[PDB]
Amino acid sequence: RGLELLSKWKATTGNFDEETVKIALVGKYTNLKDSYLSVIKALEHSSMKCRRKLDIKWVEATDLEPEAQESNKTKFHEAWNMVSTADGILIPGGFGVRGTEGMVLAARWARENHIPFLGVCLGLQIATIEFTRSVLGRKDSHSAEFYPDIDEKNHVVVFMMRLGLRPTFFQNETEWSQIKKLYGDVSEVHERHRHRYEINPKMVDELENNGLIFVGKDDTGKRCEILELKNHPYYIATQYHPEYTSKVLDPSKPFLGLVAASAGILQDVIEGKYDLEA
Amino acid sequence: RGLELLSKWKATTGNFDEETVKIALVGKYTNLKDSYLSVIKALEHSSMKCRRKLDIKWVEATDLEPEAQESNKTKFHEAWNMVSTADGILIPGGFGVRGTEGMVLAARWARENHIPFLGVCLGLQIATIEFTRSVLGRKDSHSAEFYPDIDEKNHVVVFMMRLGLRPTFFQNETEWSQIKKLYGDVSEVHERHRHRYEINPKMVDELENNGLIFVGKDDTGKRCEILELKNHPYYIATQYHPEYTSKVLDPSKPFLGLVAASAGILQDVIEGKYDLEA
Amino acid sequence: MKYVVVSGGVISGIGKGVLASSTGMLMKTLGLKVTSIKIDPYMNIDAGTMSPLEHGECFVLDDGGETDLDLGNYERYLGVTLTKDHNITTGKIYSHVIAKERKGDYLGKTVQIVPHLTNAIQDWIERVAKIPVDDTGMEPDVCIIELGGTVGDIESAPFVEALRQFQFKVGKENFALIHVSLVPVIHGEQKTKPTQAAIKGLRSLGLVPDMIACRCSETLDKPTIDKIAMFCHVGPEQVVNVHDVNSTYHVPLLLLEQKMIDYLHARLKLDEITEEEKQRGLELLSKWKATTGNFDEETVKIALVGKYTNLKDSYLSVIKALEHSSMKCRRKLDIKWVEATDLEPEAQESNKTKFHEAWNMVSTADGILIPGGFGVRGTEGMVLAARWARENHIPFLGVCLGLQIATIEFTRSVLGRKDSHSAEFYPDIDEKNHVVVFMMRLGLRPTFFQNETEWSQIKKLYGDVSEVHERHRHRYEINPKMVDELENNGLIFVGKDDTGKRCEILELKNHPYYIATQYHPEYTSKVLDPSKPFLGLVAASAGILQDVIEGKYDLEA
């Protein structure tokens, strides 16, 4: 295991010496770059598997808003150029509500135009709010955070906060899935969580029938743990935070798929053209 | 009139010697730059009234499409950077159907985010298709060019082709209008036309009630000649081609408003801070 | 943009300003950017000629213009910095059109009250309504326009023409009008007819009221509302009533509980106007519930000692600055009004009865306040009031002439020097306590704390910030030659100007609260942010000054 760790180090090092991938990371207060540290490292570990140079564009989510155009026009154009340039979009599981309105438009941009996407925690919440707000109509729908609207809340409280390593199980028909292929066809995964809200189970049949297929759920089958949009090149979200289990020799699979699809190489990464030793 | 023409020449010349405005012109085959010659000259005449340097970004409308992202990704990012950068959007009255799907997304971009806009001919058609396709829902709606859909045609045939100088009359309540202010509060205007389609009169009450107010119509009141979106900084379209009456000392009013609002100075141009002689 | 006129009545003095800025305070509850214009029918261009005896106190702007006194009521209610242009006056607008007449800007046409002057008034209102008076540089979303005088005056006729034409230059569903009108009660019955005759007057000039608001001695009877609404183009739910309330700061809650805004929201279609505004709306309501709670939830007695205190509007800003601070301390304010000249040793033989009333007030009070009086007359009594609070540890604030008199007294009693006097007694020369400094010093100027004075009670109330910004109105300052003697004896000048030559604040070392300011701090007191020199005076009069500085009385945790 000592000699193998050196060989795997020579491999990830070789993958740095041996083309760029541009990713827009869109969230609240991206100026505070340590506040997203795990997300950056999870993109780095995966980018060395793809042999491709990582270029994170930092977007303040609020600068995407239609209101920002009259308030602070210059930064609004910088934000939209980054979103328009990027080979992939990433909504990183932000803190609090402020960025939400711009993060919706970033999710819409990658739903419609076939840009690779990953939503983490609040990013799954916003992948579901957007798919509701644009595919089902339902323009009033919002996070459960906007409590007094009641009837149009996209989410429900589930305090059990849900924390720590919990399992997640693939739905047994979803053999088509890009993400459950990256997990090696294993029956279940184990992941870290930090959430007080989940997508309202009442709506999930409507989302599954329209193609926002929830390819992974919890032990009970009541909780929304993963989604994949059917017949898109790579549009994933996770309710968990996968960046809290990314390792330098074993990159976290939802982030590996985002980089590999941004590189246009996702098929060949799944088929095994990029493992470190034969 | 000789001495006055020299004074007015010294004025437009002074307005060139005496800051940039960036405008995205979005249409079919913008590579063929002589095919939009009148539109360019109408933007130049107006830009010398605003004392501001004109920078037309040329966008191929088809490169904005969600399909272009997999087909020709590089040019699709260049097209979207131009749309995202511009201080104003202009849909120039293109020839044939090809560019339509991208021109819809350019009109949506300026409806939602408060970007100044002018639609000319096919641009009014696409301002109305977009406002239908996004404000009324009605996602199947299209130009009358897609004939066999029947029920969802946004337009109707009116061959009389309508051509040459015809009048247009303001609707008598629309005192709020930015465009009818630029025309000096005169009761009517006279303009050139080249159209075989008009917006279907059956729908126009729905569009007027939702705020896409048709501030100008023909002698009969049956024909859609101008629209202004109520409570937007500058979102105009004209069924006529106003670039066929722009002159170097008297710029065509729909194009003067587009430049002046892109410069953020529209109020002061209407109030008279930029006429050539006191 | 949106606009709200407040106008009207059969009488001047009916209640407009409280219905005006109060309506504007509630526009801010919605998160809106808000501004205000007061249209005055009088012919003075500014209050700079107007002596403080009639029309009252020359209120002073950030821009240092001597405005109409009422503008202040809008800088407290809304929390905005207005400008010299927000006070339209009949003398100001005739001057502006007459200037353009001699410059020839009318291209040799004859110039007429209609349309040229009524265009000028509309062009002024829409000009001024662009100015960003609010806590961020974006143009306002609503303007409150208060029309002074009464509709049907020969002095207010140009403005009701200009406003009528403005109902079209601006659209309906962007402009609305509140008309304030009288319901006299005689023989115990509410009579509607003065509202009918004044609404007949209003529609004659062509304005139509979207609300009526009544001055009445009572709650309007259900039939009185019906008999006004049967005679005007308003529903019975838009006959508003500003009745007797516990204090003037309750009026915006009274208007909101009468569903006044739940109509203006629809009538001005205000759904047509960011998260920052929506939050700042909810915060303004929370801060209103706090100052209101601080009224419902013990008395502080303050002697205000000055010239001609009978003329109570002449001290209006000072009263409001004491009210804003008293709601932070949760304590009921009781201003004793003292004529300064009735304290004098000469008054004892001249008018003995009033002299005892004056001295009982000074002896009773928990704090003393010398308010920045006009002219010399009161000075001799104001010295004895400052002496009374120097010696016995009574809390004190001196404003302008009050710092002058705090320094004259400390000179006249701590240094001996019994001949010393204001520079106003010019021919004494050698014993003048002050020096001329005409630059009059006016408007918002900075003041900087002296860098060692960490002990200071006043620079603690300012939050340990390095400098402050304040309004001034002075032609005299304390003579710099003497200031070392005063600093060495303990009258420490804890704040000075940019040069360090000018005496801007004093605090007497080792006294519970003895402050004076050369500036007028009452011209920046706001209802949610009370002016710090007045907060210290109330809090020390309450004996709670330490705990106010430590933070036991901020509105939200």
Ligand SMILES: Nc1ccn([C@@H]2O[C@H](COP(=O)(O)OP(=O)(O)OP(=O)(O)O)[C@@H](O)[C@H]2O)c(=O)n1
């Ligand atoms: N927000 C306000 C409004 C008014 N007042 C005080 O109330 C009196 C004047 O009230 P106002 O509303 O102006 O009514 P009047 O001037 O009496 O009458 P009008 O309606 O003509 O203004 C003055 O003490 C003024 O300072 C106040 O302290 N705060």
Ligand SMILES: Nc1ccn([C@@H]2O[C@H](COP(=O)(O)OP(=O)(O)OP(=O)(O)O)[C@@H](O)[C@H]2O)c(=O)n1
């Ligand atoms: N017919 C009149 C009478 C007076 N004024 C002017 O408008 C002001 C209104 O003040 P007001 O309070 O009406 O004073 P009075 O006329 O005495 O009314 P009151 O008796 O209520 O003071 C007057 O000062 C005067 O400037 C006017 O324009 N038209």
